[PDB]
């Protein structure tokens, strides 16, 4: 057991424009083992039908996955990523800021 903690990033495919169709991403990397749970939240609610990439890893054996869905950014609507790994004492939630 080498157990490492996931590094998370929430962001959009393209620069966010209110009303313009886009893609929301949650890039989880640098973690181990591979067992990981990732949700995409809209106003606290889990978004249905979220695709993720295929499980791969880097030269240092850490795994990386990308979760994504097609959304339309609004001023009011809040989006976030919810991750759970064995190395986490509770689900870690990081909100989407179109500025990062």
């Amino acid at each position: 057991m080498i157990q490492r903690t996931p590094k998370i990033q929430v962001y959009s495919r393209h620069p966010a424009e209110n009303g313009k169709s886009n893609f929301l991403n949650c890039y989880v990397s640098g973690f181990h083992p591979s067992d990981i749970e990732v949700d995409l939240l809209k106003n606290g609610e889990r978004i249905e039908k979220v695709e993720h990439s295929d499980l791969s890893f880097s030269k240092d054996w850490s795994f990386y996955l990308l979760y994504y869905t097609e959304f339309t950014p609004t001023e009011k609507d809040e989006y976030a990523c919810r991750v759970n790994h064995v190395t986490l004492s509770q689900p870690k939630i990081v909100k989407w800021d179109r500025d990062m």
């Binding site: 157990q3 962001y11 991403n25 083992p33 591979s34 499980l55 994504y68 500025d99």
Partner: protein, 276 residues
């Protein structure tokens, strides 16, 4: 420039809920193009790149066979490994295997590598001359002697030096349009006040391929790596990559700072200032 053909194999046991899950992925450079997931009924190697969608049944039949065979060996290796350590039959364990071949910028074969990892730690490793193995983890010495007694390195040297290279060339032809296209980054700086006296200057680099890139902020024209918050290069999800760099600055002194971008798809390096 240099190109490579890499594969990543992962098998994870689930003692309670049945047979180990096996996943396999193939890469030309920073592009994935194939994958095999045995977690379904009737699993096959399937294309993950558009320039692969028109391959013959013959191709997928062979890749499905290879992947299947590997998945079964990894499943049994797991059990074997469990004994090499005094490990209980209750825990889930991980076996990883990556191998690839690289072409020099001169386009010939340059190098090959192959590695095994157990529970995330260097287990067994193929030497540089590709002619024998080495126990990296002290607990891999048996796996090592068994591998060197049966000349397993010879089958791998054959693959890496010849087979792997030939297909890397074919792949570059089939996918030239995207694989050989230097897609340059789209850059710009954003402004974000933190208080009346501070503000964040964030330099973006969007929609670029390949993934190798460098973002630096310079204060006045000097080095200034302290203060620079750098995020890891992230996949946009459409084949390109993203990355940004942010530095904290006093309100009114924005012009002192400049963002510098280096990419392979950029004729000359690029410089950005924030334009009010």
């Amino acid at each position: 420039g240099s190109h490579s053909l890499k594969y990543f194999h992962t098998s994870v046991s689930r003692p309670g809920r049945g047979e180990p899950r096996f996943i396999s992925v193939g890469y030309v450079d920073d592009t994935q193009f194939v994958r095999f997931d045995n977690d379904a009924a009737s699993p096959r190697m399937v294309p993950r790149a558009p320039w692969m969608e028109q391959e013959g049944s013959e191709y997928w039949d062979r890749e499905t066979r290879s992947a299947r065979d590997t998945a079964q060996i990894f499943r049994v290796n797991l059990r074997t490994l469990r004994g090499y350590y005094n490990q209980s039959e209750a825990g889930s364990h991980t076996l990883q295997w990556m191998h690839g071949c690289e072409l020099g910028p001169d386009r010939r074969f340059l190098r090959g590598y192959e590695q095994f990892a157990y529970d995330g730690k260097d287990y067994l490793t193929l030497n540089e001359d590709l002619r024998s193995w080495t126990a990296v983890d002290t607990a891999a010495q048996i796996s090592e002697q068994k591998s060197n007694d049966a000349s397993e390195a010879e089958h791998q040297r054959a693959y890496l030096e010849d087979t792997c290279v030939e297909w890397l060339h074919k792949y570059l032809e089939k996918g030239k349009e995207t694989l050989l296209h230097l897609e340059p980054p789209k850059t710009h700086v954003t402004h974000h006040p933190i208080s009346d006296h501070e503000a964040t200057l964030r330099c973006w680099a969007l929609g670029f391929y390949p993934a190798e890139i460098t973002l630096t902020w310079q204060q006045d024209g000097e080095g200034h790596t302290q203060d620079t918050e750098l995020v890891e290069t992230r996949p946009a999800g459409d084949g390109t990559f993203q990355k940004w760099a942010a530095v904290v600055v006093p309100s009114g002194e924005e012009q002192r700072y400049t963002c510098h971008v280096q990419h392979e798809g950029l004729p000359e390096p690029v410089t950005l200032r924030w334009k009010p």
